[PDB]
Amino acid sequence: AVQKVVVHPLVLLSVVDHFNRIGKVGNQKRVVGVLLGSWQKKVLDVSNSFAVPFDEDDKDDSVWFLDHDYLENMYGMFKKVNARERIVGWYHTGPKLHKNDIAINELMKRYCPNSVLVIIDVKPKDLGLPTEAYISVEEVHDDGTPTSKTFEHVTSEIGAEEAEEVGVEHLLRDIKDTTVGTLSQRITNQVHGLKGLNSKLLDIRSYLEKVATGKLPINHQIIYQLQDVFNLLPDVSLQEFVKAFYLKTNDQMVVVYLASLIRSVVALHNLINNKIANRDAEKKEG
Amino acid sequence: GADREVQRILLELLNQMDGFDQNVNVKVIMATNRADTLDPALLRPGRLDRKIEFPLPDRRQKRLIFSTIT
Amino acid sequence: TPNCRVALRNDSYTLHKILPNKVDPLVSLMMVEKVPDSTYEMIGGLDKQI
Amino acid sequence: EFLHAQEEVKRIQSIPLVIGQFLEAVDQNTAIVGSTTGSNYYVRILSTIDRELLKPNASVALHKHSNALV
Amino acid sequence: AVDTAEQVYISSLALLKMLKHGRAGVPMEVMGLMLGEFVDDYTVRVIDVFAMPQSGTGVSVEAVDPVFQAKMLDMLKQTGRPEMVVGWYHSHPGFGCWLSGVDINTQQSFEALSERAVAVVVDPIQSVKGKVVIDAFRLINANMMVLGHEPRQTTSNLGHLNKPSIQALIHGLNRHYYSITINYRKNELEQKMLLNLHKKSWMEGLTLQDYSEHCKHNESVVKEMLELAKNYNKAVEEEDKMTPEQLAIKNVGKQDPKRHLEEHVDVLMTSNIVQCLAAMLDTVVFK
């Protein structure tokens, strides 16, 4: 029911550490807990995390256990120390999602009506994705299609938690992930932006190819409804560049007159000042 | 009470008007109903000199004021 | 140097630098004046008095 | 590395500042400002802003928790 | 009675809990205990820390509820990873790296309970942009001062960047024994995860923004550099024949040649070309 969710840079590393610390004896690869936070204006945020040991069996994906009394005691303590924090959803690792998620969601939704699922890739860092959000919608798959689970992805964006900028700057203090070195940094911004665009669009091309082969089920009913407009949007017409031949080229030519020339003039002023100083020093040294 | 604070404010205004010292062509004019209570620091010549009194409507002028306003 | 200004520290208030005069510029003019010129050449007609 | 370092050190908070009115620029790298509550304390003047808008007795802006001339 | 150049491997999530708890209870001087373990004498490691609500009494030992602490510890043992209590943390807006009288008293009680029970001062209000303060020290008995004082042991490590604050020097803490060096568990599979994922800008470098606010921005840029025109003008007639450095020092104006340097013009130039290249790159993509 939520419009979108926003993940803080506050819980991603906590979940990863929880995976690391409880994975010492539990090698199930499956770490399940609850993510706590707040939902105020159709924007859901996560502020706390907790992990519970969790075992699975491949037989119908119905073998599991948790410590609900301890988990509930955690929630009471977290709410006591901070009232605005509330369980916004439950998270599971192992992006290859199994079938017990529907049973887990049914059990935990007594804490949150709009139960959501979160997957954290502790080891994977594919391009830049730390985690993914999932919304449970079983209100009929589509207008003319049979029943299904159909856990959709509510859009997620990494937020900007306050007071953590000081810590992250002190932590890294080596890469300086900011616009520093404006020319070179923006070049790197253009580099991985093209890298991301090429990788994702190649993935879309691969999906279209695999749909054509038909080896996988085809979710066309949303694929063409979202990609047809993308393809037919007229960004290829060049006559608007004809109408805007001076789209900014006037600003380009003034910058040539007023940034490159100005840099040349000020550099020229420095050299001729140095040459005068050097010539005077050479002549008047003795 | 706060009367000393008002005196300090006037002292700084006197400092600013002395710092003006005819540097530029700006002008300063105060309008008062009675100048008896005013501090001598502003009242003395060398800071402000021209004292002008604007009397009652001056019946002949009062009729002129009414004609102008009407 | 007494009757001057200085810079202190936060808690211990240790001296930092002997600042130039600040009391004099702020309250130079209260009811007094330093030496003007107004030379006696401008004074006239009262020669028998000066 | 040093162009990056030069662009690294220029953070200066870049955050909402405050006002304590400047008294006068005694020298370079040294200054005296007066916060609105009084508490007149000597501060350090950065080279970013100077005489171009550093008139003697005009209201200026200073860092929130630093109170430094910006 | 041995306290060498000790170092704390504090964890990033412990920092985040500290800043979140301090940001929540800003003026209340909220309390907490640093969940760490002495793996040896001086290489103390803290992996987790918790947030506890300060009681209405204030800074008191009973404010940290023993039953609540025990239940919290049991919950951590069942879910998560157990960890000992050998330290404490406290958002300290009042003053700096030292401890108040009540803070010293409750730290003395902690020292009686634990072995060291380090006294950590974290200032939530002074940490704004770049400097977060986490200073840890130990309370000492009267015997350490009458023997060879400065319990700082014989090594040249804790003397590196050891600048205790002036308020800490005049308090006993950060002066009784030593100031503990700090370290951050920037281990890989943790630090590489943070830099790759948290500070995420991966397809956002394809923005075009040719003239969204830039036509008027160029108007401002021309106006600002017109002021530079007057400034760089003003300079060329100053230009005195008495070693112009002599004129410059006493007549600083922060003009285009002096302070409004070519770097600002480079910023304007970089902004223009970046929008140019982005627009031109997508123009040839438009096929």
E 154-183: CB under 8 A from A: none
Considering only CA atoms, give the Rg of chain D.
Answer: 13
Of the candidates A185, A180, A134, A131, the one whose C-alpha atom is nearest the C-alpha of residue A158 is: A131
Residue E200 lies in a domain: no
Q: E162 and E262 share a domain?
A: no
Beta pairing class for D17-18 and D62-63: antiparallel
CB–CB of E61/E94 below 8 Å? Answer: no
Could you give the residue ranges of the DSSP H alpha helices within D10-53? none
DSSP state of E204: G
How far apart, in whole angstroms, are the C-alpha atoms of residue E119 and residue E117? 6
Q: A250 and A113 share a domain?
A: no
Method for structure elucidation: cryo-EM
Residue E285 lies in a domain: no
Q: Which residues lie closer than 8 Å to E179 by C-beta, 6 or more apart?
A: E135, E136, E137, E158, E162, E164, E168
Residue A94 lies in a domain: yes
E250 at D interface, C-beta within 8 A: no
Asked whether residue E160 is marked as a ligand-binding residue, the answer is no
CB–CB of E175/E168 below 8 Å? Answer: yes
Of the candidates E11, E16, E226, E238, the one whose C-alpha atom is nearest the C-alpha of residue E124 is: E16
Q: E108 and E250 share a domain?
A: no
Residue A28 lies in a domain: yes
Residue E96 lies in a domain: yes
- For residue E13, give the amino acid letter: L
Residue E1 lies in a domain: no
Q: E155 and E252 share a domain?
A: no
Write the DSSP string, A110-128. TT-SS-EEEEE-SS--SSS
* CA distances, C3 to each of B51, C8, C20, D23, D25 (Å): 41, 16, 10, 19, 21
CB–CB of D25/D45 below 8 Å? Answer: yes
Of the candidates A124, A94, A107, A98, the one whose C-alpha atom is nearest the C-alpha of residue A28 is: A94
Residue A182 and residue D4: Cβ atoms within 8 Å? no
Boundary-marking domain end, from A128, A158, A182: A182
DSSP state of E40: S
CB–CB of E211/E38 below 8 Å? Answer: no
Residue E201 lies in a domain: no
Q: E114 and E140 share a domain?
A: yes
Least CA distance to D9: which residue of chain A? A180
Residue A188 lies in a domain: no
Q: E125 and E265 share a domain?
A: no
Q: E143 and E189 share a domain?
A: yes
Backbone angles phi, psi at E23, to 5 degrees: -65, -30
CB–CB of E231/E255 below 8 Å? Answer: yes
Residue A201 lies in a domain: no
B18 at C interface, C-beta within 8 A: yes
Residue E103 lies in a domain: yes
Contacts of E170 in chain C (CB under 8 A): 11-12
D 6-65: CB under 8 A from E: 11, 13-15, 28, 47-52, 65
Asked whether residue E92 is marked as a ligand-binding residue, the answer is yes
Residue E286 lies in a domain: no
Q: E120 and E223 share a domain?
A: no
Considering only CA atoms, give the Rg of chain A.
Answer: 28
Q: E85 and E187 share a domain?
A: yes
C1 at E interface, C-beta within 8 A: no
How far apart, in whole angstroms, are the C-alpha atoms of residue E76 and residue D27? 59
Domain count, chain E: 2
Q: A248 and A168 share a domain?
A: no
Considering only CA atoms, give the Rg of chain C.
Answer: 21
The total of other beta-carbon atoms located within 10 Å of residue E192's CB is 12
* CA distances, E19 to each of A10, A235, E91, E171, E192 (Å): 10, 47, 9, 25, 22
Boundary-marking domain end, from E156, E175, E195: E195
The domain containing residue A156 runs over which residues? 2-182
Q: E88 and E118 share a domain?
A: yes
- For residue C43, give the amino acid letter: I
- For residue C47, give the amino acid letter: D
Q: A278 and A146 share a domain?
A: no
B 21-60: CB under 8 A from C: 41
Of the candidates E89, E71, E188, E194, the one whose C-alpha atom is nearest the C-alpha of residue A14 is: E194
Q: E185 and E221 share a domain?
A: no
Asked whether residue E198 is marked as a ligand-binding residue, the answer is no
Beta pairing class for E43-49 and E34-37: antiparallel
Residue A206 lies in a domain: no
The domain containing residue E262 runs over which residues? 206-280
E143 at A interface, C-beta within 8 A: no
Contacts of D26 in chain C (CB under 8 A): 19-20
Residue A209 lies in a domain: no
- From its phi and psi, is residue A14 left (phi > 0), alpha (psi between -120 and 50) or beta? alpha
Beta pairing class for E118-122 and E31-32: unpaired
Q: A152 and A49 share a domain?
A: yes
The total of other beta-carbon atoms located within 10 Å of residue B70's CB is 5
CB–CB of E151/E144 below 8 Å? Answer: yes
D13 at A interface, C-beta within 8 A: no
Q: A37 and A165 share a domain?
A: yes
Residue A187 lies in a domain: no
Residue A216 lies in a domain: no
Q: Which residues lie closer than 8 Å to A216 by C-beta, 6 or more apart?
A: A210
CB–CB of A30/A94 below 8 Å? Answer: yes
Q: What is Dmax (Cα atoms) for chain C?
A: 66
List own/partner pairs for A158-163 with CB under 8 A and 24 or more apart: A158/A6, A158/A7, A158/A8, A158/A9, A158/A130, A158/E197, A158/E198, A158/E200, A159/A6, A159/A7, A159/A8, A159/A9, A159/A45, A160/A9, A161/A8, A161/A9, A161/A10, A162/E23, A163/E19, A163/E20, A163/E22, A163/E23, A163/E124, A163/E127
Residue E153 lies in a domain: yes
Gap from A47 CA to chain E (nearest CA, Å):
9
How far apart, in whole angstroms, are the C-alpha atoms of residue A170 and residue E15? 11
Boundary-marking domain end, from E195, E214, E235: E195
How far apart, in whole angstroms, are the C-alpha atoms of residue B9 and residue A178? 49
Contacts of A175 in chain D (CB under 8 A): none
Please note each residue after which chain B is broken, C-to-N distance over 2.5 A, or write none.
Answer: none
Domain count, chain A: 2
Boundary-marking domain end, from E195, E221, E251: E195
Considering only CA atoms, give the Rg of chain E.
Answer: 28
Q: Do chains D and E touch (3 or more CB pairs under 8 A)?
A: yes
Where b means 16+ CB within 10 Å and e means fewer, D15-43 reads eebeebebbebbeeeebbbeeeeeeeebb
Contacts of E254 in chain D (CB under 8 A): 47, 49-52
